Ligand binder design. Structure first.
Ligand SMILES: CC[C@H](C)[C@H](NC(=O)[C@@]1(C)CCCN1C)C(=O)N(C)[C@H](C[C@@H](OC(C)=O)c1nc(C(=O)N[C@@H](Cc2ccc(N)cc2)C[C@H](C)C(=O)O)cs1)C(C)C
Ligand SMILES: Nc1nc2c(ncn2[C@@H]2O[C@H](COP(=O)(O)OP(=O)(O)OP(=O)(O)O)[C@@H](O)[C@H]2O)c(=O)[nH]1
Ligand SMILES: Nc1nc2c(ncn2[C@@H]2O[C@H](COP(=O)(O)OP(=O)(O)O)[C@@H](O)[C@H]2O)c(=O)[nH]1
Ligand SMILES: Nc1ncnc2c1ncn2[C@@H]1O[C@H](COP(=O)(O)OP(=O)(O)O)[C@@H](O)[C@H]1O
Ligand SMILES: [Ca+2]
Ligand SMILES: [Ca+2]
Ligand SMILES: [Ca+2]
Ligand SMILES: [Mg+2]
Ligand SMILES: [Mg+2]
Ligand SMILES: [Mg+2]
Lengths: 54, 427, 338, 441
């Protein structure tokens, strides 16, 4: 069982212990999707208001 | 989301609407003058949901009283709490609707409707954040039925983004003898399916049978029925009036209760069932009772259908462990009556303040497919008259056509077909 | 009123287990996709182990141990025996086995095979998928290219007389939620109704003692017993009258040592002791007995079936000690201590 | 010195945040008025605590935190709180109307209208930073704000600070405390949207937390208060290394480095021991060996799963209090033989260890007892995929019927976004299975 990289400090201590060895969208796209949803909502509200006026 | 605007239309609406304010006023420690005189500050934390605070720290209900006749509203004004209500908020006519949906919706109601909306508008202004609307009414009359649904439609046009919720009273031939009631009720359901977010199906058949068979009242009165309605209304609104996690607003309630937009008709339940004249109930008793057919406010057998969603509210000082134990026991003992394709569809709330004269109660709210039974009933009665076009002259004499009736008939039959769809649906 | 779900319709054993549970009138069978159950009688392959133990108010138990496939898959069993120090390559009761892919054990297989040819030792082997019996390395390796395990073929087996017939002992073991290893008192001998051919290995009738190959490729099937089923009381009588010893002394003792040593080995990897859900499992241990009365382990079956006369007793033992222990209402086993 | 900005989204993020910043103050000797006697450099410093706390010339130690809920009630209790003096009024951001447990209303509708004000209040903090490390984002998976608004903020943070680390503390939904039936939908939707923008996410299944409190703290019906004091302990173990002169996980990059081999599989499993009730008069003090062993007990994990039927790609032990390496390495020898710890073939079976002399701290008047030694084990195991398989199945049961879908579509979301988000989850599950593994008779 190996012990490596023994790091010491004032409020701690650390080491590794080997038991065995081995074997994004831009702001433009964000507003595009945020506007398309608002426009899908706005269409649904106006279609309702159209039906209510009927 | 914060403030709820309450509207009460017609004889039934104003009677049950009145009893509602009397019950929750006492609950929130508000006297018939509007002055607060309570023992807990839990009573005021969410007071502004239903009450407008006025100069001199007096609380005014955010209530609009509508009718096409002065009668009931005059007795409400003469009543114990009539003094609490804003007098500018009493909007009435002199004609009457004569138990005619066509009169309430198109002819007589048409003449009064804008004066109501001006009061709705004024109330909506004094709102930091309006949640939506609450309406009390019967579906069997003319005013609450015809005018109530026209008011919902008009409110929806001006406030399309807000939540519309109703306490709708369903007709029964055990309570009423007005032949035209199935017609008015079918015309009103068609409207409710399209324009409401949540409807508490309060059935006069179930209220009558509870009074007769369980409360052993030989000759039940409207006040006897209304006693069960005011208990149900106090229970189903608890989460909106008192601090809490579950269903604390109209929208959160709708998202938990409405899987499909037309399937928003709730079967309310209540335990213990009482008459207006000691012995506390255990958490296991409250749970057996609230889910029992005999405790349902709609004349449907829940065991004939499946629950799509359930909300359970426990009021008083009890064990949250035992509430949880019994709620899980009910679900685990009868798992076939709860759709498998809506996981964890039963949500529970516990509120420390009980109702008046009860140490502990339980209110159930169920979106069961068994509500189709109530709709099949009104449909059986409607079709029997409509296939012979009987009593239609009362409606056509107001400008309506047979088409509106055929359409209403179809929509309700389609709604019954939808409830069956999800009763026979498997995962 | 406890609840269960049936997710393996093909299991004869849990079909009888289901039948007996309903018959008590304290168990209800839910839809195979209803989560509000106490007991899952799950599907053989790909059981959703990760989903169990997440239903509050319900004590959940399954008829399978997650990871018991290390002992039940042919190539995995060999690997478990070879790597685990608890069993190791220094294991007397299991035949010489090598995992061959068409990682690999091809190099070490030739190494041990060629030491036997020049060592003037019998070089008969067997091939099976996780069926071939040959003496040459060509016929074995060439066949896998048409994943398998090449195991030492039992050249000198014990033979029942009259008949000069081969056999195999199937023992049923139930490991409950507490890891108590229970051996059912009744076992069966899957006999070969045709006499054993010392030199001929082409005819796969006298070499494969399976109940399927005897009802298909054997002419004299059902001659000595019914069909090729010898039970323990009968087999013990043959051992006393024809060999002096008893079944308990010459065979059962070694069988028990094998069951225990196998199941104790994987207890730290499959035990459901401090788990959100509990497991139990019925296993079918398959043994070969040589002429020197020495017991050898052939395979472990995760989903065994029973002998038609024993279903009644075995399936009642399952509900008694594995189910009603966890779900109490209103011995036919030998507890293997560890 | 490198700074960290903590962001608390929704009710869960804000209430946990509160429980954390309260523990931080007890731990660093900072008072409810924002005063720290132990800090001798007035109105500044390059100390290890300054990673989380900014300073004023008056001597106020101010959390580098942003609180965001779309409704006032919750944040108005940070304003009425014991630690009300600590926070600047512009650190607390509220809407009027909440996301109604709807991801679409939180992401699209209310999100679009408050995103810019939030990023503004975040830059107001980022501009007080000499060298900002990144963000710690606290939120629920289930709530509408918690899921919808967080996923939107994560995409924008990736834009505005592409070089910075984004770490998560996510509350996985559990029916015992669940406020909504749509929590499976919201969880998958935010997971799919936040995947590319998260470097390391720590999941806390509310069911595990509720059970630890029932079992180990003997609480009949645990509240959010109980749940959060416990979450606060695990969060403190993970961040102690950034707030104090430590040797391991000294910066947010180290978490990705030491725990995340593949970027999609960035969900380490957190185990914490010992959990003891303060209401216990007698307490037998557990050894390093005892508390180390307990890190391999499913009863102590933040998500219930079997790490035995999976593989390890990373494992790291974070000790606290009276702990010496001698006892640690001996416990690591002991457990290796007892427990079945399988690692990925291409990884060395080994552990990264860290001790932080700083003693385990508790809230005076709590359900949790003061311990001499403690340990948090962070391990990247493929066994965590069990939480994904559970949530994905719930999502599937509901989606097959399009139950509640209209609520999403009504807020502008397309029905196709649901199955897109789900295909990513089916991909994520497939990745975990690739890494994790190799009739009648
Ligand atoms: C002789 C006919 C009686 C009156 C009537 N019978 C029927 O309708 C029958 C049974 C007869 C033929 C078939 N049909 C269905 C009846 O019992 N009902 C219509 C009752 C309601 C009736 O009962 C009695 C016994 O009077 C009424 N109750 C009230 C009442 O509760 N009044 C309260 C005030 C009130 C007034 C109107 C409204 N809409 C609401 C409330 C005052 C009383 C003191 C109280 O609090 O109970 C008035 S009429 C319903 C519930 C079945
Ligand atoms: N542990 C813990 N879980 C919480 C807390 N508050 C809420 N939750 C859980 O988080 C989920 C619900 O999300 P919430 O945070 O309440 O919702 P929100 O982000 O405010 O979103 P909306 O209110 O819908 O706008 C459920 O699983 C709750 O049980 C908390 O303080 N602690
Ligand atoms: N439960 C209950 N039902 C009532 C009450 N008043 C009227 N109803 C019922 O309502 C229907 C008649 O409607 P009503 O409200 O009187 O007429 P409207 O004034 O034209 O809306 C019938 O089904 C009555 O039995 C009441 O106070 N309580
Ligand atoms: N190494 C072997 N030596 C002798 N006989 C063997 C050997 N391996 C298997 N057998 C014979 O083959 C039969 C079937 O083998 P088995 O491994 O049990 O396969 P299965 O999974 O199809 O039941 C046994 O009943 C036995 O007669
Ligand atoms: Ca007129
Ligand atoms: Ca300083
Ligand atoms: Ca990134
Ligand atoms: Mg009237
Ligand atoms: Mg019943
Ligand atoms: Mg909230």
């Amino acid at each position: 069982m190996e012990v490596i990289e023994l790091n010491k400090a004032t409020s701690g201590q650390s080491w590794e212990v080997i038991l065995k060895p081995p074997s994004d969208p831009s702001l433009e796209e964000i507003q595009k999707k945020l506007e398309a949803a608002e426009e899908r909502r706005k269409y649904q509200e106006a279609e309702l208001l159209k039906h209510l006026a009927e | 989301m914060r403030e709820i605007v309450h509207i009460q239309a017609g004889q039934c609406g104003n009677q049950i609407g009145a009893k509602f304010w009397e019950v929750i006023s006492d609950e929130h420690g508000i006297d018939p003058t509007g002055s607060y005189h309570g023992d807990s500050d839990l009573q005021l934390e969410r007071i502004n949901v239903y009450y407008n605070e006025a100069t001199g720290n007096k609380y005014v209900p955010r209530a609009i009283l509508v009718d096409l006749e002065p009668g009931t509203m005059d007795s409400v004004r003469s009543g114990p709490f009539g003094q609490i209500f804003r007098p500018d908020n009493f909007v009435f006519g002199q004609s009457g609707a004569g138990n005619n949906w066509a009169k309430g919706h198109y002819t007589e109601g048409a003449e009064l409707v804008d004066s109501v909306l001006d009061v709705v508008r004024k109330e909506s202004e004094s709102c930091d954040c309006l949640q939506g609307f609450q309406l009390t009414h019967s579906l069997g009359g003319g005013t609450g039925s015809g005018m109530g649904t026209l008011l919902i439609s008009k409110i929806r046009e001006e406030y399309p983004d807000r939540i519309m919720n109703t306490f709708s009273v369903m007709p029964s031939p055990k309570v009423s003898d007005t032949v035209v009631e199935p017609y008015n009720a079918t015309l009103s359901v068609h409207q409710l399916v399209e324009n409401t977010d949540e409807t508490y199906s309060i059935d006069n058949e179930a209220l009558y049978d509870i009074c007769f068979r369980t409360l052993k009242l030989t000759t039940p009165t409207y006040g006897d029925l209304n006693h069960l309605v005011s208990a149900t209304m106090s229970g189903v609104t608890t989460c909106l009036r008192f601090p809490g996690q579950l269903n604390a607003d109209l929208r959160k309630l709708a998202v938990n209760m409405v899987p499909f937009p037309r399937l928003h008709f709730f079967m309310p339940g209540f335990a213990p069932l009482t008459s207006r004249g000691y012995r506390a109930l255990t958490v296991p008793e409250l749970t057996q009772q609230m889910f029992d057919s005999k405790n349902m406010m709609a004349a449907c057998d829940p065991r004939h259908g499946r629950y799509l969603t359930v909300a359970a509210v426990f009021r008083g000082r009890m064990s949250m462990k035992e509430v949880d134990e019994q709620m899980l026991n009910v679900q685990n003992k009868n798992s076939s009556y709860f759709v498998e394709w809506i996981p964890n569809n039963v949500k529970t709330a516990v509120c420390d303040i009980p109702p008046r004269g009860l140490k502990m109660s339980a209110t159930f709210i169920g979106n069961s497919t068994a509500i189709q039974e109530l709709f099949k009933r009104i449909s059986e009665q409607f079709t029997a008259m409509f296939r012979r076009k009987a009593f239609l002259h009362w409606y056509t004499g107001e400008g309506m056509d047979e088409m509106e009736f055929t359409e209403a008939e179809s929509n309700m039959n389609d709604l019954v077909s939808e409830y069956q769809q999800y009763q026979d649906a498997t995962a | 009123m406890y609840t269960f779900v049936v997710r393996d319709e093909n299991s004869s054993v849990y079909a009888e287990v289901s039948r007996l549970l309903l018959a008590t009138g304290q168990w209800k069978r839910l839809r195979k996709d209803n989560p509000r159950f106490n007991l899952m009688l799950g599907e053989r392959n790909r059981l959703p182990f990760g989903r169990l133990g997440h239903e509050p108010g319900l004590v959940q138990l399954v008829n399978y141990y997650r990871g018991a496939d290390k002992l039940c898959r042919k190539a995995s069993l060999v690997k478990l025996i070879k790597t685990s120090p608890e069993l190791s390559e220094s294991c007397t009761w299991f035949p010489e086995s090598y995992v061959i892919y068409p990682t690999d054990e091809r190099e070490v297989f030739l190494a041990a095979y060629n030491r036997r040819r020049e060592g003037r030792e019998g070089n008969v082997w067997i091939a099976k998928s996780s069926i071939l019996i040959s003496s040459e390395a060509s016929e074995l390796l060439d066949f896998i290219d048409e994943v398998h395990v090449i195991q030492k073929y039992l050249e000198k087996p014990l033979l029942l007389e009259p008949g000069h017939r081969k056999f195999d002992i199937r023992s049923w073991v139930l490991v409950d939620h507490l890891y108590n290893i229970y051996l059912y008192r009744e076992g069966v001998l899957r006999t070969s109704s045709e006499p054993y051919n010392s030199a001929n290995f082409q005819d796969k009738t006298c070499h494969l003692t399976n109940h399927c190959i005897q009802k298909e490729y054997s002419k004299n099937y059902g001659r000595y017993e019914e069909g090729n089923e010898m039970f323990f009381e009968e087999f013990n009588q043959y051992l006393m009258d024809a060999l002096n010893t008893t079944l308990e002394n010459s065979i059962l003792l070694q069988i028990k040592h094998i069951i225990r040593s196998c199941l104790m080995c994987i207890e730290p990897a499959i035990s459901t002791k401090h788990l959100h859900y509990q497991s139990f499992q019925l296993f079918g241990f398959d043994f070969m007995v040589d002429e020197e009365l020495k017991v050898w382990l052939i395979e472990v079956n995760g989903a065994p079936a029973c002998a038609q006369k024993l279903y009644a007793e075995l399936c009642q033992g399952i509900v008694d000690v594995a189910i009603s222990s966890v779900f109490p209402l209103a011995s036919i086993f030998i507890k293997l201590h560890h | 010195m490198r700074e960290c900005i903590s962001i608390h989204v929704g009710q869960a993020g804000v209430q946990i945040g509160n429980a954390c910043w309260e523990l931080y103050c007890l731990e660093h000797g900072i008072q409810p008025d924002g005063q720290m006697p132990s800090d001798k450099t007035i109105g500044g410093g390059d100390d290890s605590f300054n990673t989380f706390f900014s300073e004023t010339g008056a001597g106020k130690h101010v959390p580098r935190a942003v609180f965001v809920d779309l409704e006032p009630t919750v944040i108005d209790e940070v304003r009425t709180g014991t630690y009300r003096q600590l926070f600047h009024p512009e650190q607390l951001i509220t809407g009027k109307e909440d996301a109604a447990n709807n991801y679409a209303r939180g992401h699209y509708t209310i999100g679009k209208e408050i995103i810019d004000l939030v990023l503004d209040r975040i830059r107001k903090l980022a501009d007080q930073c000499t060298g900002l490390q990144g963000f710690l984002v606290f939120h629920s998976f289930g709530g509408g704000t918690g899921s919808g608004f967080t996923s939107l903020l994560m995409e924008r943070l990736s834009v505005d600070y592409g070089k910075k680390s984004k770490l998560e503390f996510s509350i996985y939904p559990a029916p015992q405390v669940s406020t909504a039936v749509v929590e499976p939908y919201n969880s998958i939707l935010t997971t799919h949207t936040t995947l590319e923008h998260s470097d390391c996410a720590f999941m806390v299944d509310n069911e595990a937390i509720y059970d630890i409190c029932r079992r180990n703290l003997d609480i009949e019906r645990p509240t959010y208060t109980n749940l959060n004091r416990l979450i606060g302990q695990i969060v403190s173990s993970i961040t102690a290394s950034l707030r104090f002169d430590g040797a391991l996980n000294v910066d947010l990059t180290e978490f990705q480095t030491n725990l995340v081999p593949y970027p999609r599989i960035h969900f380490p499993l957190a185990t914490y021991a010992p959990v003891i009730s303060a209401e216990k008069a007698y307490h037998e003090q557990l050894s390093v060996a005892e508390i180390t062993n307990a890190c391999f007990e499913p009863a102590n994990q933040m998500v219930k799963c079997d790490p035995r039927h999976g593989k390890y790609m990373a494992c790291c032990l974070l000790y606290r209090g009276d702990v010496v390496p001698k006892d640690v390495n001996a416990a690591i020898a002991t457990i290796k033989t007892k427990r079945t710890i399988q690692f990925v073939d291409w990884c060395p079976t080994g552990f990264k260890v860290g001790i932080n002399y700083q003693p385990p701290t508790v809230v005076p008047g709590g359900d949790l007892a003061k311990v001499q030694r403690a340990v948090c084990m962070l391990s990247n195991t493929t066994a965590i995929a069990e939480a994904w398989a559970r949530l994905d199945h719930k999502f599937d049961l509901m989606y097959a019927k399009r139950a509640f879908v209209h609520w999403y579509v009504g807020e502008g979301m397309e029905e196709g976004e649901f199955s897109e988000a789900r295909e990513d989850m089916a991909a994520l599950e497939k990745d975990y299975e690739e890494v994790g593994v190799d009739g009648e008779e």
